[model samples]
Target: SAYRKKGKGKGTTVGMGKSSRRFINMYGFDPTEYSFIQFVDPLTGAQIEENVYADIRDIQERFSEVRKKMVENDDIEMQALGSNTTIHAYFRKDWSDKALKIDLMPHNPLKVCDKTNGIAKFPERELELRQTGPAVEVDVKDIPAQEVEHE
Candidate 1:
C-alpha cells in the first residue's frame, strides 16, 4: 500500500506566460514596444496607477475603514487585516516608442478553498479586485474548478 502524503499535492502549472502573451497579442500591444506586469487590488473600482503617488497614510486609513466594515458585516469569513490577503500596492515601469508608462496595481481579497482528499473546494465566492493604470488592460477567465464541476 502506498503511504499518503502529509501535505497538499503539487497542482498542475498553468502557463501564465503563454496566456499573458496571448492577451497582449489579442489586445494589439506590440510585444517589442511594451512591457507587462500583473498585480491584485482590493477596492472594487479604484484605479491603481492613478493612486500610487497618494499619501501612504491616506491609503492605510481607507484600508483600515474597509477592513473594519468587512469584519463587522461578516463580508469576509476569515480575518485578514494584516495577513497576506490585505490590500497591497505594486508598481511596474514600462518603456515604449511612444511614451514611458507606469503601471500600478492594488491587492484585493480572494477566497481560496482549502483542499482535502485531493479535491479543491470553496465555501464562498472569492473576491479578487485589481487596479491598474488607464493604459493597461485586463482579461480574466472563469474559475477552473467551477468550470470542471459544471461539465
Candidate 2:
C-alpha cells in the first residue's frame, strides 16, 4: 500500500531511533561465550591471519589456544633465525584476566554542561575568555576585538 512510504523520502525522514540497539547484551556477545577469535601475523613478514574456535567458556582456555599458536609461530621464527634472534618472546604460563592482561578500555563519561557560579564552565563556551594553563589569566582588555568572520 502507498499508505506506507518506502523510498528516498522515507530515507530522508530523520526521527528518534532505538538507543538500546547499541547496548551490549542485545547487540554484542559475552566474552566467555563459545566463539571464534582472530589472530593476525604481521603482513610485512608473509602476512597471515588465523582463527581459533573454542567451545569451552573458560577465558584462559580461549586465550591459551591463541597463545599456543603464537608460541608455535615464535618457535618457527627462532628456528629460522638461529643466530640473529633479537625478538624476545615471553608469555605467562597461566591465563586469567590478569595473566591474559585484559584491561578495561577507558572512555569519557557523559556530563551535564552548565553555568558554575555565573561563569560559563563548559569547554568551548569560555574558549576566548579563559586562560588554558594553570594561573594564567586572560586579560580581556589586552585581547583586542577584530572582524574574524567564519561560519
Candidate 3:
C-alpha cells in the first residue's frame, strides 16, 4: 500500500534491530547445557577435555569421577592462596570463582584444586568420595539423544 496526501508522504520504515550476533571466541552456543572439564595426566601428559554435563556426577565412579570432576571442573576456582607457599588452585561450580576453605599444604605432589563449599574434594587414599547424598543414585554414563521411552 502507498499513501500520499500532498504534504505528508510515507515510503519505507526502518529501526535498530536487537542484534543477537557478536564478536567472541565462540558463538551459536547460547543455550549451551555443557561446560568444559579438563584432565592432566601424570603419565602420558595428554590434557583431556571432557564436557562436565553440568556440575554433577554419579555415585558409581564416585571418587574417580568427582576427583576427575573436581579436577576437571572437577577442576575448580583455581587461585593461589598467598596464606603460605600454597600456590594452590581450587574451584567453584557456581558464579563464585573460588575454592573451599581447606587447609592444604604446598609440599604435596598433586597440584590439585578443591571445589568450593565442599562440593568436591582432592582424594588422598584408595578411597571413594564419601558423598553425603546417594550411594545409590541414578548416574548417567552418556546420552546419544537418539531414543525415548514409551512402548
Off by over 4 Å in 2: 1-57, 75-151
lDDT of 1 at 36: 38
Rate residue 24 of model 2 by lDDT: 44
Candidate with top lDDT is 1
Clashing pairs in 3: 69-74, 70-74, 70-75, 71-74, 71-75, 72-75, 76-91, 77-90, 77-91
Q: Write the per-residue lDDT of candidate 2 for residues 28-71, one digit (tens) a residue.
A: 66566322232222211221122244222443345455546655
Model 3 over residues 16-69: C-alpha lDDT tens digits? 878687665855655635334433322212233434342223312333543454
Residue 93 alpha-carbon offset, candidate 1, angstroms: 12
Best by TM-score: 1
Candidate 3: list runs displaced more than 4 Å: 1-34, 53-92, 99-151
Q: lDDT per prediction?
A: 0.43, 0.34, 0.35
User: How do all models score by TM-score?
Assistant: 0.27, 0.16, 0.17
Residue 24's lDDT within candidate 3 is 59
Winner on lDDT (1 vs 2): 1
> Judged by lDDT against the true structure, how good is candidate 3?
0.35
Model 1 stretches with alpha carbons more than 4 Å out: 1-40, 43-52, 77-136, 139-151
